[PDB]
Design an enzyme around this catalytic site. Structure first.
Site, PDB file in Angstrom:
ATOM      1  CG  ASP A  48      -0.253   0.034   2.546  1.00 51.73           C
ATOM      2  OD1 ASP A  48       0.991   0.035   2.591  1.00 51.73           O
ATOM      3  OD2 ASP A  48      -0.954   0.054   3.578  1.00 51.73           O
ATOM      4  CB  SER A  50       2.460   2.130   4.839  1.00 50.57           C
ATOM      5  OG  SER A  50       2.155   0.743   4.845  1.00 50.57           O
ATOM      6  CG  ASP A  52       5.899  -2.496   8.449  1.00 51.77           C
ATOM      7  OD1 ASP A  52       4.944  -1.711   8.565  1.00 51.77           O
ATOM      8  OD2 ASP A  52       5.775  -3.657   8.020  1.00 51.77           O
ATOM      9  CG  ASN A  59       2.333   0.292   8.515  1.00 51.49           C
ATOM     10  OD1 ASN A  59       2.563   1.280   7.824  1.00 51.49           O
ATOM     11  ND2 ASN A  59       1.811  -0.821   8.019  1.00 51.49           N
ATOM     12  CG  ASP A 101      -4.922  -0.337  18.538  1.00 45.76           C
ATOM     13  OD1 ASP A 101      -5.156  -1.507  18.915  1.00 45.76           O
ATOM     14  OD2 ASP A 101      -4.699  -0.076  17.335  1.00 45.76           O
TER      15      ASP A 101
END
Ligand SMILES: [Cl-]
Ligand SMILES: [Cl-]
Ligand SMILES: [Cl-]
Ligand SMILES: [Cl-]
Ligand code: NA
EC number: 3.2.1.17
Length: 129
Positions: A48, A50, A52, A59, A101
């Site tokens: 995508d 992005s 890491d 990420n 989260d």
């Protein structure tokens, strides 16, 4: 920096990760081993767009700013490069946010596929902690 297993365990313990949100220290060491091979400079690009970063492969889509992930968030409020430092403080603080989260350590694919449900204490066995 490439950490040794017990060296990293001790650094993570000092920064409050042992039993953080119920995850014993062995879970964090296992996750670091399979995400980055204990290498703070590890980077990996995703399909995508992005990337890491660092010892826990955090990420850029959600957690840090690298200037090249359009439409992403920066929930740890740090440049992604800060996650590659030999000082793991930034990575640990950000990981605390991640694991709080909601999905816990399932946010780390390598933990889910290679640490979850195993004898993770083996990763801290022998260490002086
Ligand atoms: Cl453990
Ligand atoms: Cl492997
Ligand atoms: Cl960006
Ligand atoms: Cl949990
Ligand atoms: Na970002």
């Amino acid at each position: 920096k490439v950490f040794g297993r017990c060296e990293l365990a001790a650094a993570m313990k000092r920064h409050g990760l042992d039993n953080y949100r119920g995850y014993s220290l062995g879970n964090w060491v296992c996750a670091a081993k399979f995400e980055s091979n204990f290498n703070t400079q590890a980077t990996n690009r995703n399909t995508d767009g992005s990337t890491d970063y660092g010892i826990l492969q955090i990420n850029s889509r959600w957690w840090c700013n690298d200037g090249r992930t359009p439409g992403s968030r920066n929930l740890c409020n740090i440049p992604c490069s800060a996650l590659l430092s030999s000082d793991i403080t930034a990575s640990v603080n950000c990981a605390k946010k991640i694991v709080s989260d909601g999905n816990g350590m399932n946010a780390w694919v390598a933990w889910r596929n290679r640490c979850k449900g195993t004898d993770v204490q083996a990763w801290i066995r022998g260490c002086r902690l």
